[PDB]
Amino acid sequence: GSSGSSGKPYKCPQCSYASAIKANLNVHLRKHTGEK
Ligand SMILES: [Zn+2]
């Protein structure tokens, strides 16, 4: 196996999380911008 990285541009500023869609990162950040 010789594969590189995922190439996913939209990455979390707090996690190792990445996605191919800006709105998927937007939903992920709603958990970082507030709670309870
Ligand atoms: Zn995150």
Swiss-Prot record:
Coiled coil: none annotated. It is found in: Nucleus; Cytoplasm, Cytosol. Signal peptide: none annotated. A zinc finger (C2H2-type) spans 10-32. Zn(2+) 2 binds at residues 12, 15, 28, 32. It comes from the Eukaryota. Isoform 1 is strongly expressed in placenta, spleen, kidney, testis and peripheral blood leukocytes. Expressed in CD4+ and CD8+ T-cells, CD19+ B-cells and CB14+ monocytes. Isoform 3 is strongly expressed in placenta, ovary, tonsil, CD19+ B-cells and CD14+ monocytes. May be involved in transcriptional regulation. Overexpression causes down-regulation of a number of genes involved in the immune response. Some genes are also up-regulated. This is Zinc finger protein ZFAT. It comes from Homo sapiens.
